[PDB]
Design a protein around this ligand. Sequence first.
Ligand code: HEM
Length: 147
Amino acid sequence: TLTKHEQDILLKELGPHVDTPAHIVETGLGAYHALFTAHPQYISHFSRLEGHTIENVMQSEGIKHYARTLTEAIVHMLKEISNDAEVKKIAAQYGKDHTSRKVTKDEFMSGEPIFTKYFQNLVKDAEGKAAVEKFLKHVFPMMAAEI
Ligand code: HEM
């Protein structure tokens, strides 16, 4: 399980990106710009991104909705990342948000390297970039097991 120290480093270094509603949305938008630039065929899987392609998805109203839900799901797991039983419970809930959707388990896991690089570019030092990678490597398989 991640240590309380690692939880503290993550919360401290990601704090300026998740401290206001506007910051939450800008952090999420960056994650989707990375995910869809690598895999633009994933836009079609999200119901509110109907009618859009890579040329115009980032300007949509629907992408702002998912920017908040993705980022706030991540911050909920970060807040409990040193509590093994709670983060496993939370991650199971977020994985279950994907079971009946159009996304495959392989597509879901393809987000790991993209979100790791993106979130690592938001933090300031190597310790925090390593914690971001450890965090995502721990929660991605918990969520993916529900898919
Ligand atoms: C850190 C990893 C991830 C987290 C925490 C996460 C979290 C979520 C959450 C909370 C929802 C529900 C959205 C809502 O309330 O509207 C959702 C939906 C969904 N996610 Fe993820 N997700 C992650 C990775 C991915 C990846 C890599 C994909 C790949 C395409 C993906 C595809 C989807 C799809 C297709 C939906 C359903 C959206 C709809 O049809 O409106 N997720 N995800």
